[PDB]
Design a protein around this nucleic acid. Structure first.
Ligand SMILES: Nc1nc2c(ncn2[C@@H]2O[C@H](COP(=O)(O)OP(=O)(O)OP(=O)(O)O)[C@@H](O)[C@H]2O)c(=O)[nH]1
Ligand SMILES: [Mg+2]
Ligand SMILES: [Mg+2]
Lengths: 86, 56, 116, 506, 74, 271, 81
RNA sequence: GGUUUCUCUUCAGAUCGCAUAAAUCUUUCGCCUUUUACUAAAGAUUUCCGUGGAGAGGAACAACCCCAAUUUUUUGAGGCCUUGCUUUGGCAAGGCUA
C-alpha cells in the first residue's frame, strides 16, 4: 500500500533477470504497468554476475545501454549498484 | 504593549490647561511651545481623515 | 502615369460619411462598401493616387476618433489628367494646380530636381 | 551599455526529417506573436514594443511534442502583420517550406490574408491555417453556437474559394477534417483541431476511436442519441450539428461558467471536467483564471503541432518542388541534385536571406538555410552574389565563419556545427554581401550556381531625398545608408545624377 | 484500447509469416482484425524440408503470430 | 489592517451600475489615438500643438534646397497631425521623441437592453451573417452505412449545465469595465490617491462648451503630462517612522476619539 | 501509457533495435510503433539464433513477440520518474 | 503542522504609487528699479507622503465484484534418438512422437 517499494529501488542500480536467465545490469530509472524495464548504460552478462572471485569477474560481457524490455518476462529484481549521481 | 486610554483622560487634561495662563502649569508652557515644529503634521493628519459626507 | 493605391478601411456604422468626404478631399474613387458578416462593421474599399496617399491614415483616424482605420497597397498605374507638354500652362509655384496641369507641373518640378 | 539537451536537439538536427520549416503569417494584430509568446513559455519556464506593432520578422527554433510524444524541430518565421513590411513575408516564405496563415475569429478575409495566400500560392508552399482568437465569438461577439458555426464555415469557404482563385490544381480543399486548420485563442491558452479535441475527449472518457471520431465532426454531419450513430441529414430533432453539439455548446458553457458563474458552478463543473483548482488559484481574476483553466483543460498546443506536422514537407521531402524556383537551373548536373539529396553532405550551397546587425557594432548576423552541406566554425566558405554569374567571379568574396548562432526569439544559442535542413545565423560574411547571398564551399571548387535575388509582392513607389546638415559627414551618412540597405529587403537607395541620395520605399 | 494493426498501408501485399513452430508461410496479407489476427490468401508454407506448398486462404492466427515481413516497399 | 479585498460578481455588477454616472462610456483606446501621453511627449519635444491638447515652453529654442519652392508639389498641405504621427519621416532633428502608434483591433461588445433575452442572443445590432458563395462545398465525407457507433458512455462534453444563468450577462459586461471594476480582488488604496475625474478631463472633443471650460480642459491635460514626464523611481530608501518613534516614548498616550473633537482640539492647540 | 512505452513511442524516428522473444535481433530506424507494441521497422539488420545477419526492408511484428529492445544514447534526458 | 495581529530588528522599487507634493544647485526664459517671494524650460541631486522584501519574538485563532490464448499472480514450449562440434563438461543441427 505504501507503494514506495518500487521507486526506492528506482533511481538505484538493479540487476534484472528475465525469464531468459542472464544478468541485465542497469539503473532502475522507472518501471511500467506490465513491469517493463527502461534502464540505461546497461550491460548484458551471460556467463555470470561476478562476486569478488579471486579467479575473475569478466566473462561473457556485452554493452546493451539504454534497453527497454517488456515486463512479460521480467522475473527477478536485485540491487547490484547504488545511484551514480550522473 | 502600549495600550489605549479612556477619552476623558485627555479631555480632562486639555480642558484643564485651557489656554496656558494659569500659573499652575507653567512648564508645559515651554513644552507647548517646542511642540510647534510639528503642528504641520497634526494638520495634514487631521485633514486627510475627514468624514466624507454620508457619515455623521 | 502615376500609381494608385487600393485601401481597405474597416469602419463602424456612422463614419461612412467621414471616409466618403475624406476620399473626395483626396480624389478618392470609392469602389466598394460592404458589411462584415457576424459583426456590425463595414469594410470600404477604394483607390487613391499615390500622391494623395500621404497622411490620409492620420486624417481619417483623427476625424473618426480612430474608429475607422485604413490600410493601403499599390494597385495599378493610371493616366494623370495632365498634358505633359504645353508651354502656355504656367505654374503658380505653391498654390495647388487644378487637374488640367498635374502632369505639366509633375514634369517641370521633377526635371527641375533631376532632369534640367 | 542546454547541457544535456543541445546534444538532443543536434541529433534531431542530423535527423533532418523531424524538422519543420514554416513562415507564420497572416494579417495585422491577429495573434501571431502572442501565440509565439505563450509558446516560448511552454518551451522554457525560464520601437516595436511601444509601437505595439510588429515590424520585422523573427526566427524561432523549438522542440515540441505532437499528440504521441515524438519531439520535433520547429523553425518558425514569425512575420509582420503590417501591409508595408510584406518584404519580410517574402523573405520568410523563401527560407521556410510552408506557410501558416493565422486568421481572426472576428474578421476573416482582408488585405494581408488575401495577398498572403496569393504569395504562398505563387511560391508553392504548404498551406496551413489557424483560426485564432475564438473568445471574440463568445465573450465579445455573443454569438449563439449555430450562427457561430455559420461564421466559421464562412471564413473557411471564403479563404478556400480564394485559394481556388490562385491555384490551378484543387489538389487541396481546406477544412479541419484533413489537418489543414488549427483552432486557437492564443492568449487564453488554447490550441486544438477536431482531432485533438476528440482525442482528449476519449483520453478522459471511454475507449472510443478518437481518429474515426475526428473524421465525423466538421461539415454538416449530425448525431442522433438513441442510434449513437452519425447521420447525414436525418434528425427532425431540429438540433445542432455534430461540431456544434460537441465543441461549441460545451465551450460556450465553459466560458459562460468561467466569467458568469466563477463563484458557485465552477467547483462542481471543475470536478466534472476533472481539473481541481486550489483556493488561491481560484482567488484569481477572471482573465488569468480563464487562461489557467483553459490550459488545464485543453492541454498545451496540440492542434497546431499536430496539424502542422500532418501537412508538412520537412525539407528532406522538401527540396524537390522548391529547387525549381530557388535554383537558377533547378536540376541539371551538379547542385540541383546536390541539394535535392537534402543530406548533410558535401556541396554546401546556402541561401542567406536575412542580416540582423548587432546593437553593439556594425557587423551583421547573416541568416539562411542549409540546402546543401554542413557548415561549421572556422570553415572557409565563399559567397555567391546577386550579380555573380558563372563567369563573373569577382563578385564572390571568400571568407570564413567567426561564430555560429541559432535563434530562439531573443536568446542566442552558439554551437560549432550544423548540417543541411536547418536555418542558421552566420558570423563573418556580412561585409561582402548584400540583401541576399548564396554560400558555397571555401577553396573547394567544383562549380556553383546562384538563386535569383528575392522577388516581392509590393510596388515600391515613395521617394525620399536625404542629406547631412554639414556636407562634411557625408561619408558617415553613406555608411549609414549602407547599413540600412543591408538590413532592409527592398529599401532601395540610389545616388542620383543631381548628386543626391534618394531612397525608394513602400 | 482495442487499437488494431496499422495495416491499411500494409493491406494487399505479399508478406512471409514467421510464427511459432518455426512456422514459415508466404502469402498476400490483405486484412486482419484488431487482435492482430491475419487473413492471408495465396499462402505457400515453407516447411523445414524447404518445400513451399500453396494452400490458399486461411485466418492468420495472431495468437502465436510473431512477425510478417513483406516483399514490396509499402 | 483592511487590505487585499476579494469580491463577488453580483456585488461588482451592482456597484458598476451604481457608479454609472461618474464613469467613462469607453470600451478601448482607439479613441485616444493622437491624445495619449506619448503623443503629448512628442508634441512637447517638437513644439507643435495638437488641436485640443496642452502647450509647453519650447524645449531648446539660413538656406536649404529641399525647401526650394520651384521643386515642390503641394497637393495636400502638411499639418501638425502628420508631423506628430510620423515623427521621423515628417521632421528634421526629431530629438527626445516617443513614436506612439496604435492599430488596436476595435472591440465590439454589445450592450443589452433588458436582462431577459439569453446571454448568447443574436441581436439586430450584429449584421445578419448571410454568408454566400458558389455551390458551397463538398468534403471527403465519410458516409455512414459502412458503420460507426458511439459506445453510450460519453456525452457532449457537458450538457447537464445550461449555457447561461442570472450571472452570465454580468460576467460579460464586467469584462470591459474601467480598471477599478474589471477586477475582482486587489489591494486597497489611500482615500486621496483616487482621482475621480481623470476620465472626464482626458476626453478629446468636448464639442462646444464655453472657452472658459475648454481652456480648463487643456490646462489639466498639461498638468497630467508634466506629472507623467517627470516621474522618478523612488531611487533610495531609509525608513524612519515618526509616529512609532513617538508612541514608543513615555510621554505619548493613545485613544480613539471623535473627529470633530480632535478638530477643536487641534485648533485650540495651534492657537 | 507506460513510461517505457512512451520512451518507445518518442523513439519513433530515432536509431534503435530489438531482440524478439526467440533470441534473434533486428536493428533499424523508427518507422512505426504503438501503445499496443506493434513494431514497424525499416531498413533493418537481422541477426539470427546462430548469428546470421542481413538487411530486411520493412516489417510489423506483434508486441508480445519482443523481449528486449535497444535505444540510442538520446532519450534518457520525464526525469521526474 | 497554518492564518490574523502586536511589536522588535533588517533590505529594495529600474518603467510607480493606474496617485503624484516640495526643496537645493548649474544654466537659459520672464516679470523689473534692490533682495526675498515668483515665472517656465532643461540638467543634476534631495526631503517628504505611502508601498515592497527579509528576519525575530509575541499574541489570538484553526489541529495533536468479476478475469484473461500476442507482453507477466492458470497457459499444451513437452521429452528423447542420432549427428557435428569442441579437452569432458556443454553448444548447434535433423527426426520420432502421443
Ligand atoms: N482578446 C484576445 N486577443 C488575443 C488572443 N490571442 C492573441 N491575441 C492578440 O494578440 C496580440 C499580441 O500581439 P500580436 O497581434 O500577435 O502582434 P502581431 O500580430 O504578430 O504583429 P506582427 O508581428 O506585425 O504581425 C494582442 O494584442 C491580442 O490582441 C486571445 O486569445 N484573445
Ligand atoms: Mg507581431
Ligand atoms: Mg541696500
Amino acid at each position: 500500500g505504501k507503494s514506495s517499494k518500487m521507486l526506492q529501488h528506482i533511481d538505484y542500480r538493479m540487476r534484472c533477470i528475465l525469464q531468459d536467465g542472464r544478468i541485465f545490469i542497469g539503473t532502475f530509472k522507472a518501471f511500467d504497468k506490465h513491469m517493463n524495464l527502461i534502464l540505461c548504460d546497461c550491460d548484458e552478462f551471460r556467463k555470470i554476475k561476478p562476486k569478488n572471485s579471486k579467479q575473475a569477474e569478466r566473462e561473457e560481457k556485452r554493452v546493451l545501454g539504454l534497453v527497454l524490455l517488456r515486463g512479460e518476462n521480467l522475473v527477478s529484481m536485485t540491487v547490484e549498484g547504488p545511484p551514480p549521481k550522473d | 504593549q502600549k495600550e489605549d486610554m479612556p477619552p476623558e483622560h485627555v479631555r480632562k487634561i486639555i480642558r484643564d490647561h485651557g489656554d496656558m495662563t494659569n500659573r499652575k502649569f507653567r512648564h508645559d508652557k515651554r513644552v507647548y511651545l517646542g511642540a510647534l515644529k510639528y503642528m504641520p503634521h497634526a494638520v495634514l493628519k487631521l485633514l486627510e481623515n475627514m468624514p466624507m459626507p454620508w457619515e455623521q | 502615369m502615376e500609381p494608385y493605391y487600393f485601401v481597405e478601411v474597416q469602419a463602424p456604422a456612422d463614419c461612412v460619411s467621414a471616409v466618403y468626404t475624406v476620399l473626395a478631399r483626396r480624389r478618392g474613387h470609392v469602389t466598394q462598401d460592404a458589411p462584415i458578416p457576424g459583426s456590425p462593421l463595414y469594410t470600404i474599399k477604394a483607390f487613391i493616387p499615390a500622391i494623395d496617399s500621404f497622411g490620409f491614415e492620420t486624417d481619417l483616424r483623427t476625424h473618426t476618433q480612430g474608429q475607422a482605420f485604413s490600410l493601403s497597397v499599390f494597385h495599378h498605374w493610371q493616366i494623370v489628367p495632365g498634358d505633359p507638354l504645353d508651354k502656355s500652362i504656367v505654374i503658380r509655384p505653391l498654390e495647388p494646380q487644378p487637374a488640367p496641369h498635374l502632369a505639366r507641373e509633375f514634369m517641370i518640378k521633377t526635371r527641375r530636381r533631376k532632369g534640367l | 551599455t542546454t547541457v544535456y539537451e543541445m546534444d538532443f536537439l543536434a541529433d534531431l538536427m542530423d535527423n533532418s526529417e523531424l524538422i519543420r520549416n514554416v513562415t507564420l503569417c497572416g494579417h495585422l494584430h491577429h495573434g501571431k506573436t502572442c501565440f509565439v509568446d505563450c509558446l516560448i513559455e511552454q518551451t522554457h519556464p525560464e520601437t516595436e514594443q511601444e509601437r505595439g506593432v510588429g515590424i520585422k520578422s523573427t526566427p524561432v527554433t523549438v522542440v515540441l511534442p505532437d499528440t504521441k510524444g515524438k519531439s520535433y524541430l520547429f523553425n518558425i518565421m514569425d512575420t509582420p502583420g503590417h501591409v508595408n513590411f510584406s518584404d519580410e513575408v517574402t523573405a520568410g516564405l523563401r527560407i521556410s517550406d510552408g506557410v501558416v496563415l493565422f486568421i481572426d475569429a472576428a474578421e476573416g478575409v482582408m488585405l494581408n490574408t488575401e495577398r498572403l495566400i496569393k504569395h504562398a500560392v505563387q511560391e508553392r508552399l504548404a498551406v496551413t491555417v489557424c483560426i485564432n482568437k475564438i473568445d471574440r465569438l463568445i465573450l465579445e461577439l455573443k454569438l449563439p453556437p449555430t450562427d457561430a458555426y455559420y461564421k466559421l464555415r464562412h471564413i473557411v469557404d471564403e479563404v478556400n474559394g480564394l485559394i481556388s482563385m490562385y491555384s490551378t490544381d484543387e489538389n487541396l480543399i481546406l477544412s479541419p477534417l484533413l489537418g489543414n486548420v488549427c483552432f486557437s485563442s492564443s492568449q487564453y491558452s488554447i490550441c486544438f483541431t477536431l482531432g485533438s479535441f476528440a482525442k482528449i475527449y476519449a483520453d478522459t472518457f471511454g475507449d472510443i476511436n478518437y481518429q474515426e471520431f475526428a473524421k465525423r465532426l466538421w461539415g454538416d454531419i449530425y448525431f442522433n442519441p438513441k442510434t449513437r450513430k452519425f447521420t447525414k441529414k436525418a434528425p427532425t430533432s431540429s438540433s445542432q450539428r455534430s461540431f456544434v453539439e460537441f465543441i461549441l455548446e460545451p465551450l460556450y458553457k465553459i466560458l459562460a461558467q468561467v466569467v458568469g458563474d466563477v463563484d458557485t458552478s465552477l467547483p462542481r463543473t471543475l470536478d466534472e471536467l476533472g481539473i481541481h483548482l486550489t483556493k488561491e488559484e481560484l482567488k484569481l481574476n477572471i482573465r488569468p483564471l480563464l487562461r489557467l483553466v483553459c490550459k488545464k483543460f485543453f492541454g498545451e498546443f496540440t492542434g497546431f503541432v499536430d496539424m502542422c506536422v500532418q501537412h508538412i514537407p520537412s525539407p528532406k521531402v522538401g527540396a524537390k518542388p522548391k529547387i525549381e524556383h530557388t535554383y537558377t537551373g533547378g536540376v541539371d548536373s551538379d547542385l540541383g541534385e546536390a541539394m535535392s539529396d537534402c543530406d548533410p553532405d558535401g556541396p554546401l550551397m546556402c541561401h542567406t536571406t536575412k542580416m540582423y546587425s548587432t546593437d553593439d557594432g556594425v557587423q551583421f548576423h547573416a541568416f539562411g538555410r542549409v540546402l546543401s552541406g554542413t557548415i561549421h566554425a572556422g570553415q572557409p566558405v565563399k559567397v555567391l552574389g546577386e550579380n555573380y554569374t558563372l563567369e563573373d567571379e569577382e563578385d564572390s568574396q571568400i571568407c570564413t565563419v567567426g561564430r555560429l548562432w541559432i535563434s530562439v526569439a531573443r536568446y542566442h544559442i552558439e554551437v560549432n556545427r550544423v548540417p543541411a535542413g536547418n536555418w542558421v545565423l552566420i558570423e563573418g560574411v556580412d561585409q561582402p554581401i548584400v540583401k541576399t547571398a548564396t554560400i558555397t564551399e571555401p577553396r573547394g571548387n567544383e562549380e556553383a550556381q546562384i538563386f535569383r535575388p528575392l522577388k516581392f509582392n509590393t510596388t515600391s513607389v515613395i521617394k525620399i531625398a536625404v542629406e547631412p546638415v554639414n556636407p562634411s559627414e557625408l561619408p558617415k551618412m553613406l555608411d549609414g545608408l549602407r547599413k540600412v540597405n543591408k538590413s532592409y529587403p527592398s529599401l532601395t537607395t540610389k545616388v542620383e545624377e543631381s548628386g543626391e541620395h534618394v531612397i525608394l520605399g513602400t | 484500447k482495442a487499437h488494431p494493426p496499422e495495416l491499411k498501408k500494409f493491406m494487399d501485399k505479399k508478406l512471409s509469416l514467421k510464427l511459432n513452430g518455426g512456422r514459415h508461410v508466404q502469402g498476400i496479407l490483405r486484412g486482419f482484425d484488431p487482435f492482430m489476427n491475419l487473413v492471408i490468401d495465396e499462402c505457400v508454407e515453407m516447411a523445414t524440408s524447404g518445400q513451399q506448398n500453396n494452400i490458399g486462404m486461411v485466418v492468420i492466427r495472431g495468437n502465436s503470430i510473431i512477425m510478417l515481413e513483406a516483399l514490396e516497399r509499402v | 489592517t483592511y487590505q487585499r479585498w476579494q469580491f463577488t460578481l453580483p456585488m461588482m455588477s451592482t456597484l458598476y451600475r451604481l457608479a454609472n454616472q461618474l464613469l467613462t462610456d469607453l470600451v478601448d483606446d482607439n479613441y485616444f489615438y493622437l491624445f495619449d501621453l506619448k503623443a503629448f511627449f512628442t508634441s512637447k519635444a517638437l513644439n507643435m500643438a495638437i488641436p485640443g491638447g496642452p502647450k509647453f515652453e519650447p524645449l531648446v529654442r539660413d538656406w536649404n534646397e529641399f525647401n526650394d519652392i520651384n521643386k515642390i508639389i503641394i497637393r495636400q498641405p502638411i499639418r501638425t497631425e502628420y508631423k506628430i504621427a510620423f515623427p521621423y519621416l515628417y521632421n528634421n532633428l526629431p530629438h527626445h521623441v516617443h513614436l506612439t502608434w496604435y492599430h488596436t483591433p476595435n472591440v465590439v461588445f454589445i450592450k443589452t437592453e433588458d436582462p431577459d433575452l439569453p446571454a448568447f442572443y443574436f441581436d439586430p445590432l450584429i449584421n445578419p451573417i448571410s454568408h454566400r458563395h458558389s455551390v458551397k462545398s463538398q468534403e471527403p465525407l465519410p458516409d455512414d452505412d459502412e458503420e460507426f457507433e458511439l459506445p453510450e458512455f460519453v456525452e457532449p462534453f457537458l450538457k447537464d449545465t445550461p449555457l447561461y444563468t442570472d450571472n452570465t450577462a454580468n460576467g460579460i459586461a464586467l469584462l470591459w469595465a474601467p480598471r477599478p471594476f474589471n477586477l475582482r480582488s486587489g489591494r486597497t488604496r489611500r482615500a486621496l490617491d483616487i482621482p475621480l475625474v481623470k476620465n472626464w478631463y482626458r476626453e478629446h472633443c468636448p464639442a462646444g462648451q464655453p472657452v472658459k471650460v475648454r481652456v480648463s480642459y487643456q490646462k489639466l491635460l498639461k498638468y497630467y503630462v508634466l506629472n507623467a514626464l517627470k516621474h522618478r523611481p523612488p531611487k533610495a530608501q531609509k525608513k524612519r517612522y515618526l509616529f512609532r518613534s513617538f508612541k514608543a516614548t513615555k510621554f505619548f498616550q493613545s485613544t480613539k476619539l471623535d473627529w470633530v473633537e480632535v478638530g477643536l482640539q487641534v485648533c485650540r492647540q495651534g492657537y | 501509457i507506460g513510461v517505457p512505452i512512451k520512451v518507445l513511442h518518442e523513439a519513433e524516428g530515432h536509431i534503435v533495435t530489438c531482440e524478439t522473444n526467440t533470441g534473434e535481433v533486428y536493428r533499424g530506424k523508427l518507422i512505426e510503433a504503438e501503445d499496443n507494441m506493434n513494431c514497424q521497422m525499416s531498413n533493418i539488420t537481422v541477426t539470427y539464433r546462430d548469428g546470421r545477419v542481413a538487411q530486411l526492408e520493412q516489417v510489423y511484428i506483434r508486441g508480445s513477440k519482443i523481449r528486449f529492445l535497444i535505444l540510442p544514447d538520446m532519450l534518457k534526458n520525464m526525469l521526474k520518474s
